[PDB]
Short mmCIF file of C-alpha atoms and ligand atoms in Angstrom, two decimals:
data_model
loop_
_atom_site.label_atom_id
_atom_site.label_comp_id
_atom_site.label_asym_id
_atom_site.label_seq_id
_atom_site.Cartn_x
_atom_site.Cartn_y
_atom_site.Cartn_z
CA UNK A 1 10.36 1.59 -0.84
CA UNK A 2 13.48 1.66 1.35
CA UNK A 3 16.70 0.42 -0.19
CA UNK A 4 15.35 0.12 -3.73
CA UNK A 5 15.90 1.82 -7.08
CA UNK A 6 13.92 3.95 -9.50
CA UNK A 7 11.96 1.64 -11.79
CA UNK A 8 12.50 1.95 -15.52
CA UNK A 9 9.80 4.33 -16.74
CA UNK A 10 6.53 2.53 -17.55
CA UNK A 11 8.18 -0.90 -17.18
CA UNK A 12 5.59 -1.96 -14.56
CA UNK A 13 2.45 -1.16 -16.59
CA UNK A 14 0.23 -2.90 -14.01
CA UNK A 15 1.18 -0.45 -11.25
CA UNK A 16 -1.49 2.10 -10.42
CA UNK A 17 -1.68 5.09 -8.10
CA UNK A 18 -4.73 5.67 -5.92
CA UNK A 19 -5.38 9.41 -5.63
CA UNK A 20 -7.82 11.41 -3.51
CA UNK A 21 -6.23 14.82 -3.98
CA UNK A 22 -2.83 13.23 -3.39
CA UNK A 23 -1.32 9.81 -3.95
CA UNK A 24 -2.11 7.72 -0.88
CA UNK A 25 -1.81 4.05 -1.90
CA UNK A 26 -0.79 1.76 -4.73
CA UNK A 27 -2.76 -0.86 -6.63
CA UNK A 28 -2.48 -3.41 -9.41
CA UNK A 29 -4.53 -3.55 -12.61
CA UNK A 30 -5.91 -7.10 -12.94
CA UNK A 31 -8.43 -6.58 -15.76
CA UNK A 32 -9.57 -3.73 -17.98
CA UNK A 33 -12.10 -2.70 -15.34
CA UNK A 34 -10.67 -3.84 -11.98
CA UNK A 35 -7.80 -2.93 -9.65
CA UNK A 36 -6.58 -4.84 -6.56
CA UNK A 37 -5.40 -2.87 -3.52
CA UNK A 38 -5.36 -3.12 0.30
CA UNK A 39 -8.56 -2.84 2.34
CA UNK A 40 -6.85 -0.42 4.72
CA UNK A 41 -6.48 1.95 1.71
CA UNK A 42 -10.27 2.35 1.54
CA UNK A 43 -11.70 5.78 0.81
CA UNK A 44 -15.25 6.53 -0.29
CA UNK A 45 -14.00 8.23 -3.48
CA UNK A 46 -10.80 7.34 -5.36
CA UNK A 47 -9.30 8.45 -8.66
CA UNK A 48 -7.22 5.69 -10.25
CA UNK A 49 -4.13 6.89 -12.10
CA UNK A 50 -2.67 4.41 -14.58
CA UNK A 51 0.41 4.73 -16.73
CA UNK A 52 2.21 6.76 -14.06
CA UNK A 53 5.89 7.15 -13.47
CA UNK A 54 6.29 10.61 -11.89
CA UNK A 55 3.14 11.28 -9.86
CA UNK A 56 3.86 15.03 -9.79
CA UNK A 57 4.34 15.55 -13.55
CA UNK A 58 1.44 15.25 -15.99
CA UNK A 59 3.19 13.88 -19.06
CA UNK A 60 -0.14 13.18 -20.81
CA UNK A 61 0.34 9.42 -21.32
CA UNK A 62 -1.44 8.62 -18.04
CA UNK A 63 -5.07 7.54 -17.80
CA UNK A 64 -6.97 9.11 -14.90
CA UNK A 65 -10.17 7.14 -14.22
CA UNK A 66 -12.55 7.61 -11.29
CA UNK A 67 -13.51 4.55 -9.28
CA UNK A 68 -17.13 3.47 -9.75
CA UNK A 69 -17.05 0.81 -7.03
CA UNK A 70 -14.73 0.45 -4.03
CA UNK A 71 -15.15 -2.89 -2.26
CA UNK A 72 -13.13 -3.90 0.79
CA UNK A 73 -13.07 -7.57 1.64
CA UNK A 74 -16.11 -7.85 3.95
CA UNK A 75 -14.03 -9.67 6.56
CA UNK A 76 -11.24 -7.11 6.69
CA UNK A 77 -10.37 -6.47 10.33
CA UNK A 78 -8.33 -3.42 11.32
CA UNK A 79 -7.05 -5.02 14.53
CA UNK A 80 -5.72 -8.31 13.15
CA UNK A 81 -5.19 -7.03 9.57
CA UNK A 82 -6.76 -10.25 8.28
CA UNK A 83 -8.19 -10.09 4.75
CA UNK A 84 -6.42 -6.82 3.86
CA UNK A 85 -7.51 -6.76 0.23
CA UNK A 86 -9.81 -4.49 -1.76
CA UNK A 87 -11.25 -4.34 -5.27
CA UNK A 88 -11.86 -1.15 -7.25
CA UNK A 89 -14.02 -1.03 -10.37
CA UNK A 90 -13.09 1.67 -12.87
CA UNK A 91 -15.87 3.92 -14.16
CA UNK A 92 -14.61 3.31 -17.70
CA UNK A 93 -12.29 0.49 -18.80
CA UNK A 94 -8.57 1.09 -18.76
CA UNK A 95 -7.12 1.12 -22.27
CA UNK A 96 -4.47 -1.58 -22.60
CA UNK A 97 -1.25 -0.31 -24.21
CA UNK A 98 2.53 -0.34 -23.74
CA UNK A 99 2.28 1.68 -20.50
CA UNK A 100 -0.95 0.24 -19.06
CA UNK A 101 -1.66 -3.48 -18.84
CA UNK A 102 -2.79 -6.19 -16.49
CA UNK A 103 -0.88 -8.49 -14.14
CA UNK A 104 -1.85 -12.16 -14.08
CA UNK A 105 -3.44 -13.53 -10.94
CA UNK A 106 -1.49 -16.29 -9.17
CA UNK A 107 -2.10 -19.94 -9.94
CA UNK A 108 -0.33 -21.28 -6.83
CA UNK A 109 0.74 -19.94 -3.40
CA UNK A 110 4.02 -18.00 -3.13
CA UNK A 111 7.08 -20.23 -2.94
CA UNK A 112 9.80 -19.35 -0.45
CA UNK A 113 12.97 -18.17 -2.14
CA UNK A 114 11.24 -16.91 -5.28
CA UNK A 115 12.56 -13.54 -6.45
CA UNK A 116 9.82 -10.90 -6.59
CA UNK A 117 9.42 -7.26 -7.55
CA UNK A 118 7.79 -4.85 -5.08
CA UNK A 119 7.00 -1.33 -6.20
CA UNK A 120 5.51 1.95 -5.08
CA UNK A 121 5.92 5.61 -4.22
CA UNK A 122 6.42 5.01 -0.51
CA UNK A 123 8.85 6.55 1.94
CA UNK A 124 12.49 5.77 1.14
CA UNK A 125 13.83 6.27 4.69
CA UNK A 126 13.51 4.03 7.76
CA UNK A 127 14.10 7.04 10.03
CA UNK A 128 12.81 10.25 8.49
CA UNK A 129 10.58 11.14 5.57
CA UNK A 130 11.70 11.24 1.93
CA UNK A 131 8.80 10.56 -0.40
CA UNK A 132 9.69 10.05 -4.08
CA UNK A 133 7.93 11.46 -7.11
CA UNK A 134 9.23 8.63 -9.35
CA UNK A 135 8.13 5.01 -8.97
CA UNK A 136 10.54 2.89 -6.91
CA UNK A 137 11.24 -0.82 -7.26
CA UNK A 138 12.74 -3.47 -4.96
CA UNK A 139 13.97 -6.96 -5.89
CA UNK A 140 13.10 -9.13 -2.88
CA UNK A 141 12.61 -12.84 -2.14
CA UNK A 142 9.65 -14.59 -0.60
CA UNK A 143 10.64 -15.52 2.95
CA UNK A 144 9.66 -18.81 4.54
CA UNK A 145 6.48 -18.74 6.57
CA UNK A 146 8.64 -19.74 9.55
CA UNK A 147 10.69 -16.57 9.09
CA UNK A 148 7.47 -14.55 8.85
CA UNK A 149 5.85 -16.15 11.90
CA UNK A 150 8.99 -15.94 14.04
CA UNK A 151 9.32 -12.22 13.23
CA UNK A 152 5.74 -11.46 14.33
CA UNK A 153 4.70 -14.05 16.93
CA UNK A 154 1.01 -14.83 16.81
CA UNK A 155 0.28 -12.13 14.19
CA UNK A 156 0.68 -13.90 10.83
CA UNK A 157 -2.70 -15.16 9.65
CA UNK A 158 -3.49 -17.53 6.81
CA UNK A 159 -3.92 -14.52 4.52
CA UNK A 160 -0.38 -13.23 4.96
CA UNK A 161 3.16 -13.89 3.82
CA UNK A 162 6.51 -12.13 4.18
CA UNK A 163 8.80 -10.86 1.43
CA UNK A 164 12.06 -9.07 2.01
CA UNK A 165 15.30 -9.19 3.98
CA UNK A 166 15.80 -10.01 7.66
CA UNK A 167 19.04 -7.99 7.77
CA UNK A 168 17.11 -4.73 7.39
CA UNK A 169 17.45 -1.85 4.96
CA UNK A 170 15.21 -3.11 2.13
CA UNK A 171 11.42 -3.05 2.48
CA UNK A 172 8.19 -1.39 1.47
CA UNK A 173 7.00 1.48 3.65
CA UNK A 174 4.25 4.07 4.18
CA UNK A 175 2.52 5.10 0.91
CA UNK A 176 3.39 1.71 -0.69
CA UNK A 177 0.31 -0.13 0.65
CA UNK A 178 -2.00 -1.65 -1.92
CA UNK A 179 0.80 -1.99 -4.45
CA UNK A 180 2.04 -5.16 -6.07
CA UNK A 181 4.40 -7.96 -5.21
CA UNK A 182 5.02 -9.74 -8.51
CA UNK A 183 6.82 -13.10 -8.73
CA UNK A 184 7.33 -15.06 -11.96
CA UNK A 185 4.87 -12.84 -13.81
CA UNK A 186 2.01 -13.18 -11.29
CA UNK A 187 0.61 -10.93 -8.59
CA UNK A 188 1.41 -12.89 -5.44
CA UNK A 189 1.12 -10.10 -2.86
CA UNK A 190 -0.43 -6.79 -1.90
CA UNK A 191 1.65 -4.42 0.23
CA UNK A 192 0.03 -4.50 3.66
CA UNK A 193 1.98 -3.92 6.89
CA UNK A 194 5.13 -4.28 8.95
CA UNK A 195 6.68 -3.06 12.17
CA UNK A 196 8.45 0.09 11.08
CA UNK A 197 10.09 -0.01 7.65
CA UNK A 198 13.20 -2.01 6.78
CA UNK A 199 13.95 -2.82 10.41
CA UNK A 200 16.15 -5.82 11.16
CA UNK A 201 14.11 -9.02 11.62
CA UNK A 202 10.83 -7.21 10.84
CA UNK A 203 10.14 -7.93 7.16
CA UNK A 204 7.23 -6.68 5.12
CA UNK A 205 3.94 -8.55 5.51
CA UNK A 206 1.84 -8.94 2.37
CA UNK A 207 -1.64 -10.20 1.56
CA UNK A 208 -1.55 -13.62 -0.12
CA UNK A 209 -3.52 -12.87 -3.30
CA UNK A 210 -3.83 -16.58 -4.15
CA UNK A 211 -6.16 -17.03 -1.18
CA UNK A 212 -8.57 -14.50 -2.74
CA UNK A 213 -8.77 -15.70 -6.36
CA UNK A 214 -12.31 -16.98 -5.84
CA UNK A 215 -13.39 -13.83 -3.97
CA UNK A 216 -11.96 -11.73 -6.79
CA UNK A 217 -13.75 -13.79 -9.45
CA UNK A 218 -17.04 -13.69 -7.53
CA UNK A 219 -16.89 -9.96 -6.80
CA UNK A 220 -16.07 -9.09 -10.41
CA UNK A 221 -18.95 -11.26 -11.59
CA UNK A 222 -21.40 -9.82 -9.07
CA UNK A 223 -20.51 -6.24 -10.07
CA UNK A 224 -20.57 -6.44 -13.87
CA UNK B 1 -0.76 13.30 27.58
CA UNK B 2 -2.33 12.72 24.17
CA UNK B 3 -0.44 15.73 22.82
CA UNK B 4 2.88 14.45 24.21
CA UNK B 5 2.77 11.12 22.34
CA UNK B 6 5.29 10.62 19.56
CA UNK B 7 4.04 10.44 15.99
CA UNK B 8 3.05 6.86 15.13
CA UNK B 9 2.53 5.69 11.56
CA UNK B 10 1.18 2.41 12.88
CA UNK B 11 1.97 -0.85 11.08
CA UNK B 12 -0.15 -0.33 7.96
CA UNK B 13 1.50 1.18 4.92
CA UNK B 14 -0.98 3.64 3.39
CA UNK B 15 -0.35 7.39 3.55
CA UNK B 16 -3.34 9.16 5.04
CA UNK B 17 -2.22 12.78 5.38
CA UNK B 18 -2.43 13.54 9.10
CA UNK B 19 -0.99 15.90 11.69
CA UNK B 20 0.55 15.42 15.12
CA UNK B 21 1.59 17.88 17.79
CA UNK B 22 5.39 17.96 17.88
CA UNK B 23 6.46 18.77 21.43
CA UNK B 24 9.90 19.84 20.22
CA UNK B 25 8.28 22.58 18.10
CA UNK B 26 5.24 23.44 20.20
CA UNK B 27 3.11 23.11 17.06
CA UNK B 28 1.70 20.51 14.71
CA UNK B 29 3.50 18.77 11.85
CA UNK B 30 2.38 16.45 9.04
CA UNK B 31 2.97 12.72 8.79
CA UNK B 32 1.79 9.63 6.90
CA UNK B 33 -0.66 7.73 9.02
CA UNK B 34 -0.54 4.17 7.73
CA UNK B 35 -4.28 3.64 8.19
CA UNK B 36 -4.42 1.37 11.26
CA UNK B 37 -3.36 1.40 14.89
CA UNK B 38 -1.26 4.36 15.93
CA UNK B 39 -1.99 6.60 18.88
CA UNK B 40 -4.14 9.59 19.76
CA UNK B 41 -1.72 12.30 18.56
CA UNK B 42 -3.23 12.06 15.11
CA UNK B 43 -5.47 14.69 13.51
CA UNK B 44 -7.01 15.30 10.09
CA UNK B 45 -5.75 18.88 9.69
CA UNK B 46 -3.25 21.31 11.15
CA UNK B 47 -6.00 23.56 12.51
CA UNK B 48 -7.74 20.61 14.19
CA UNK B 49 -4.48 19.39 15.71
CA UNK B 50 -3.84 22.86 17.13
CA UNK B 51 -7.44 23.09 18.37
CA UNK B 52 -6.89 19.95 20.45
CA UNK B 53 -3.21 20.33 21.32
CA UNK B 54 -2.19 23.99 20.91
CA1 CA C 1 2.78 11.54 -14.26
#
């Protein structure tokens, strides 16, 4: 997260860390057994870390749970970035508590101008590398689809929307992918891609979770 | 020419721990590969990067 702030500890209890020896992507807990992330975050083995604030300090109030299933959207495409969404089934259910809880799935598409919360442990610099141990947060509005499409001509598919600031300086960045964009208490977006980080007129591009509510329901049901 | 390319995260926003040959240092350095796109100056490990580029 470039241009954000350190989140209040454990105040985003739906935020998870995906770990394969190190933190490499974010995710969102959507049920006791399932996490949503980005398909480009796929690895064959993933440890899910819930309840995290500082990824380098084992406080003891985290829950580390190995992934039992890791399912990219079958129509994910690494060239177009279409369908950049992934589901992870936990090998044992996450225990819901003050620090670990689910985020509601969206009931309507994202509305331009809505204030959202983007979060992750991504790079904090647009030029350079400064990766934070503590979870970072960014208050950012949904941009119009026209703003998104004009920023990336011919690249914004049906599965995508933009959140952020055209003036630059405030964006998600590398190591944020898979993490949540939450608007009005619902998970509207998954951190996906952008040209650089926090560049002027190049806002973050996010997967439109609403377009995958049926795929999520069907995949959870097929893998129970 | 591969080893002269600048480090490229690519557009995706994961952090796959990778290495690139830094021509200003004459050796390899770590970076977050975002998980898509990028260029050929991109290697799993330091030793592999130096095997190709050193
Ligand atoms: Ca911790």
